[PDB]
Amino acid sequence: TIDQWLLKNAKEDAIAELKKAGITSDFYFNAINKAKTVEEVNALKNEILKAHA
């Protein structure tokens, strides 16, 4: 199974820690659900610190 894959797991979990970080860009929250796996979602949020800040 694992169909849950979609990667929609760390989606809100991470973004939930971003909206408060002060970053509200959609190129980080939107491309978040586009990532591949959880490592790609949490990795994107870690790139904003250098891919935008």
End-to-end CA distance of the chain: 39
Cα atoms in the Cβ-side hemisphere of radius 13 Å centred on 5: 5
Give the C-alpha distances (Å, rounded to integers) separating 17 from 2, 10, 12, 21: 25, 10, 8, 6
Tell me the backbone φ, ψ of residue 11, rounded to 5 degrees.
-55, -75
Method used to obtain the model: NMR
Contact 37, 10 (CB under 8 A): no
Measured distance CA(41)–CA(33) in Å, rounded: 7
Domains of the chain: 1-53 (1.10.8.40)
Contact 17, 45 (CB under 8 A): yes
Place of tokens 């973004």: 15
Give the burial class of 11: count Cβ atoms within 10 A of its Cβ; 0-12 exposed, 13-18 middle, 19 or more buried: middle
Give the C-alpha distances (Å, rounded to integers) separating 4 from 9, 16, 32, 37, 44: 8, 20, 16, 11, 20
